[PDB]
Swiss-Prot record, chain A:
Motif Nuclear localization signal 1 (NLS1): positions: 124-139
Protein family (similarity comment): Belongs to the influenza viruses PA family.
Positions of Mn(2+) 2 binding: E80, D108
Name of the protein described by the UniProt record: Polymerase acidic protein
Residues the record lists as binding Mn(2+) 1: H41, D108, E119, I120
Shown stretch of the complete protein: 1 to 205 of 716
Modifications after synthesis and translation: Phosphorylated on serines and threonines by host kinases, including human casein kinase II.
Function: Plays an essential role in viral RNA transcription and replication by forming the heterotrimeric polymerase complex together with PB1 and PB2 subunits. The complex transcribes viral mRNAs by using a unique mechanism called cap-snatching. It consists in the hijacking and cleavage of host capped pre-mRNAs. These short capped RNAs are then used as primers for viral mRNAs. The PB2 subunit is responsible for the binding of the 5' cap of cellular pre-mRNAs which are subsequently cleaved after 10-13 nucleotides by the PA subunit that carries the endonuclease activity.
Gene that specifies this protein: PA
Assembly and binders: Influenza RNA polymerase is composed of three subunits: PB1, PB2 and PA. Interacts (via C-terminus) with PB1 (via N-terminus).
Localization of this protein: Host cytoplasm; Host nucleus
Naturally occurring in which organism (per UniProt): Influenza A virus (strain A/Northern Territory/60/1968 H3N2)
Curated annotation (Swiss-Prot), chain B:
Function summary: Plays an essential role in transcription initiation and cap-stealing mechanism, in which cellular capped pre-mRNAs are used to generate primers for viral transcription. Recognizes and binds the 7-methylguanosine-containing cap of the target pre-RNA which is subsequently cleaved after 10-13 nucleotides by the viral protein PA. Plays a role in the initiation of the viral genome replication and modulates the activity of the ribonucleoprotein (RNP) complex.
Organism domain of life: Viruses
Record protein name field: Polymerase basic protein 2
Recorded family membership: Belongs to the influenza viruses PB2 family.
Curated annotation (Swiss-Prot), chain C:
Transmembrane domains' residue ranges: none
Subunit structure: Influenza RNA polymerase is composed of three subunits: PB1, PB2 and PA. Interacts (via N-terminus) with PA (via C-terminus). Interacts (via C-terminus) with PB2 (via N-terminus); this interaction is essential for transcription initiation.
Coverage span on the entire protein: 708 to 756 of 757
Source taxon at top rank: Viruses
Identification of the protein by name: RNA-directed RNA polymerase catalytic subunit
RNA sequence: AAUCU
């Protein structure tokens, strides 16, 4: 399974995913499908952020590739593709500038138009229970939520959608490609995953 | 307010006593995160502040020290000397509170007591 | 401090973040933003190669 | 009282005995990370100096 | 009426 996620994704995704897995304190071999889920999260966040630039207002103007000029301002700031310290630093800087509320757990992005955080999630099981799990974890929240599903249907709070529908379609095309290229290999069965294994490892001197 | 001097036979006993009594609410683990939020508000990380006394002290010291340029390190050192507690073993006669231990070289000797009463306000636990 | 990244990585990252947050509502104008982002880019071209 | 030649009589092997009695019924990694100092001070050497 | 290095 590790071989597949090393083949499909470009090496930046797997690089940062292995970095984050090492920071977690896990073993890549004892826990594998988490690695692939992390890669998918990274990729959809990158696509949600890329192909988006800002105008004088918000509500992203989209480009094929950014034009060379002073207008370098991205509408979206990425948080999860980072070390722990730098991510919390971004969060605290934002919360101290705009007077926003401080989350208890790291979101994945920050949007400047509506001025709030975003916590994307991707799940095999369909939405409306994982949504409330995300919600009762993210308590007393203003951070928007935008969760995807491998089938092709999404969800959000207040029926609010923070970008175009074409970028959503792009995410969904990549996601469905992932799922039914997985089905060719026969490893889709092992995606019902949970954190297991005794990490209280014996000390050895 | 000074008073007379009395010569007599004095017995001192060695005891642990407070130099700095600290803030009674902060427990010396919250105080360091308070110091962090006041002086270094973006480099604090995930720690939210919970107690109300933390928020009170934070807003007070944050509006006082708004745009100072003394140094963050010295401000932090002095806030520590303000908030965290600090003890020492010494030979003591008379009073054991901190306001009476900073002047123990003047109030108490080997043969003489010097009556003295500091000027500020006193905590009622001591009383 | 705590971290595993090289010092230059954290340094240039924080430079970019502070630039953005200080341009959005505050002191930094567009010229400074573009110039220091250019310098960050050259720092990357020096470290990664 | 003072003791004469206190630092020359005291042997590291007695310290290893003491260590192995104090780590009695403990994990072997602990017993093995505390047993190394008296070993290394039983096979020690000494530079003589300037000359 | 005290138990914090």
């Amino acid at each position: 399974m590790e071989d597949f996620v090393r083949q499909c994704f470009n090496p930046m995704i797997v690089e940062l995913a292995e970095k984050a897995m090492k920071e977690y304190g896990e073993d890549l071999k004892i826990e594998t499908n988490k690695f692939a889920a992390i890669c998918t999260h990274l990729e959809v966040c990158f696509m949600y952020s890329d192909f988006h630039f800002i105008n004088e207002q918000g509500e992203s103007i989209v480009v094929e590739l950014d034009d060379p000029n002073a207008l370098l301002k991205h509408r979206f700031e990425i948080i999860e593709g980072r070390d722990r310290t730098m991510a919390w630093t971004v969060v605290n800087s934002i919360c101290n500038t705009t007077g926003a509320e401080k989350p208890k757990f790291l979101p994945d992005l920050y949007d400047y138009k509506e001025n709030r955080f975003i916590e994307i999630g991707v799940t095999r099981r369909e939405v409306h229970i994982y949504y409330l799990e995300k919600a009762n974890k993210i308590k007393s929240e203003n951070t928007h939520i935008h969760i995807f599903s491998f089938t092709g249907e999404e969800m959000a709070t207040k029926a609010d959608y923070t970008l175009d529908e074409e970028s959503r379609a792009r995410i969904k095309t990549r996601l469905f490609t992932i799922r039914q290229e997985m089905a060719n290999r026969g490893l889709w069965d092992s995606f019902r995953q949970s954190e297991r294994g005794e990490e209280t490892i014996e000390e050895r001197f | 307010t000074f008073g007379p001097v009395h010569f007599r036979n004095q017995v001192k006993i060695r005891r642990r006593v407070d130099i700095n009594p600290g803030h009674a609410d902060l427990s010396a683990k919250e105080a360091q995160d308070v110091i962090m939020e006041v002086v270094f508000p973006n480099e604090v990380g995930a720690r939210i502040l919970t107690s109300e006394s933390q928020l009170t002290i934070t807003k007070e010291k944050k509006e006082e020290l708004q745009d100072c340029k003394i140094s963050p390190l010295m401000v932090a050192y002095m806030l520590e000397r303000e908030l965290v507690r600090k003890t020492r073993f010494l030979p003591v006669a008379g009073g054991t509170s901190s306001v009476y231990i900073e002047v123990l070289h003047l109030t108490q000797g080997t043969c003489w007591e010097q009556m003295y009463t500091p000027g500020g306000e006193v905590r009622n636990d001591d009383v | 401090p705590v971290g595993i990244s090289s010092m230059v990585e954290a340094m240039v990252s924080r430079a970019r973040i502070d630039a953005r947050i200080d341009f959005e509502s505050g002191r930094i104008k567009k010229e400074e933003f573009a110039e220091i982002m250019k310098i960050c880019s050259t720092i990357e071209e020096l470290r990664r190669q | 009282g003072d003791n004469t030649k206190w630092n020359e009589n005291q042997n590291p092997r007695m310290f290893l005995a003491m260590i192995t009695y104090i780590t009695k019924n403990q994990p072997e990694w602990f017993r093995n990370v505390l047993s190394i100092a008296p070993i290394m001070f039983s096979n020690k050497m000494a530079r003589l100096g300037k000359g």
